[PDB]
Amino acid sequence: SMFLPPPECPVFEPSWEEFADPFAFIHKIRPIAEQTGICKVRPPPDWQPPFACDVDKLHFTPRIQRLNELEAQTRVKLRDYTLRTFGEMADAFKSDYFNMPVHMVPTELVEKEFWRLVSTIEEDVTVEYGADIASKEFGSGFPVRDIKLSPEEEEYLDSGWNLNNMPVMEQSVLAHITADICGMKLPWLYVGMCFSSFCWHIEDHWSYSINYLHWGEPKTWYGVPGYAAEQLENVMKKLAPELFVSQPDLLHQLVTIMNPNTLMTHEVPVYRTNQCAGEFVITFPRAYHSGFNQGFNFAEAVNFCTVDWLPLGRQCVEHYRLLHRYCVFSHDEMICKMASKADVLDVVVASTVQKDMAIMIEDEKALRETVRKLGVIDSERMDFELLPDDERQCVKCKTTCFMSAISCSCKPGLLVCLHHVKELCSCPPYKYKLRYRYTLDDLYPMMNALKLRAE
């Protein structure tokens, strides 16, 4: 009546055989889980990675969070608690809030109460949490190579479900991005407390995320299937238009808390789950998700990109251009890097990259014909990958240039992508230069190498 819990998302319990290869598994469940946006995966009973830490030596800087529905919050960027003193604070907070033993409050009640307090103007609840990538002060919850590791640790060093390994596996596509994308390719560590919350969002470049709860009280999730992303955005834009104003950069992305019943009222499908310790949650491309912690806990999450995702990745960058949103990396640069390594690619990867590259090349061909017809005649090869990211964004749409751009000696260092030739300066186009990474004659052999590898 006050809060009606969304229907449960799918839960999978793979056999060790099914589980072993995360990429095969995710591909298998995809027709089901992409309809719900998120799903939960329970590992085989004896898949049990070792969790061991000195709570007195793990330190982190706490972030502070107000809990008001529809209020703007800023996406996190990469004071001090130890894990012990954070834990003591967190447990006392929850215990005091409910006047109940810290681990005896029903999950249904915490959820109900979360949605009450965020919607009540009178209530001014603030909580704290940890969020950052692994560091010497607070390392991964999974085993990593370095000290003498136990045999138990050794066993899980190379697991496909060890989140440190996920990015660099063979069927991962984000693997050999040579660009610095630490915030995206490295796992994030999250230390939660009762009500600490992550606002509604999708992943950068519409990637997947895989999320593991190492220990502690459950994490409550809400998820929306990718097909309803724009429906959700329209609902939010109606209720919180200030979140949709143009953002100056990626450090000023605005996100918010919003009751899933509000989405369900507006015919947006929403699913829920309680993720418990030892369980995975997977989010699918462009699947909006949000959630909050039931209590003191420790989670680890990483983005990843399969071959299934490649065409969506291209669509996402198109979408970013139309919205004038900054990119985390150049999709075309990633594609060309993979083509340049065609001989060592997994063959299914090679086949899928070939297809995206074909689209890339035909789009590039047409764009170059168009700018030639606008009077741009001079050209010069340019190694875009050498430029700092913030030195090769299109002045107009902020896209990260790689295949080509237009420059003018009138505006030293400024670039526009080929969609925005008219947005650079008032000089006539014959003053312009087409800067290009590859000629069309360079590109066809690169694509052919992929075809040969794919056989």
Q: Please state the φ and ψ torsions of residue 317, each to the nearest 5 degrees.
A: -70, -35
Q: Can residue 173 be called a binding residue for ligand 77J (CB under 6 A)?
A: no
Residue 131 contact, options ligand 77J, Zn ion, Mn ion, none, Cβ 5-8 Å cut-off depending on partner type? ligand 77J
Beta strands in 262-344 (DSSP E): 271-275, 280-283, 289-293, 297-304
Give the separation between CA 182 and CA 190, rounded to whole angstroms: 16
Q: Can residue 196 be called a binding residue for ligand 77J (CB under 6 A)?
A: yes
Residue 250, Ramachandran bin (φ over 0: left; ψ between -120 and 50: alpha; else beta): alpha
Q: Can residue 397 be called a binding residue for ligand 77J (CB under 6 A)?
A: no
Among 433, 311, 428, which Cα is nearest to 363's? 311
Per-position x/- string for 201-240, each x denoting binding to Mn ion as judged by CB under 5 A, each - no binding: --------x-------------------------------
Applying the rule CB under 5 A, the residues between 303 and 332 that interact with Mn ion are: 324
Q: Which of 1, 15, 99, 246 binds Mn ion (CB under 5 A)?
A: 246
Say if residues 448 and 353 touch (Cβ distance below 8 Å). no
Applying the rule CB under 6 A, the residues between 6 and 25 that interact with ligand 77J are: 7-12
Q: Please state the φ and ψ torsions of residue 132, each to the nearest 5 degrees.
A: -175, 170
Q: Can residue 422 be called a binding residue for Mn ion (CB under 5 A)?
A: no
Residue 324 contact, options Zn ion, Mn ion, ligand 77J, none, Cβ 5-8 Å cut-off depending on partner type? Mn ion
Closest distance to Zn ion from the beta carbon of 423 (Å): 7
Say if residues 224 and 124 touch (Cβ distance below 8 Å). no
| Residue closer to ligand 77J (CB basis): 301 or 328 | 301
CA separation, residue 376 to residues 62, 366, 373, 419 (Å): 53, 14, 7, 13
Give the separation between CA 183 and CA 198, rounded to whole angstroms: 16
Per-position x/- string for 28-47, each x denoting binding to ligand 77J as judged by CB under 6 A, each - no binding: ----x---x-----------
| Residue closer to ligand 77J (CB basis): 293 or 330 | 293
Closest distance to Mn ion from the beta carbon of 226 (Å): 13
Q: Can residue 209 be called a binding residue for ligand 77J (CB under 6 A)?
A: yes
Say if residues 36 and 9 touch (Cβ distance below 8 Å). yes
Q: In what order do the strands lie in the sheet with 289-293?
A: 197-201, 289-293, 219-223, 271-275
Sole residue written with tokens 């999320």: 211
Closest distance to ligand 77J from the beta carbon of 104 (Å): 21
Binding site for Mn ion (CB under 5 A): 103, 209, 246, 324
Binding site for ligand 77J (CB under 6 A): 7-12, 32, 36, 76, 129, 131, 190, 192, 196, 198, 203, 209, 211, 283, 293, 299, 301
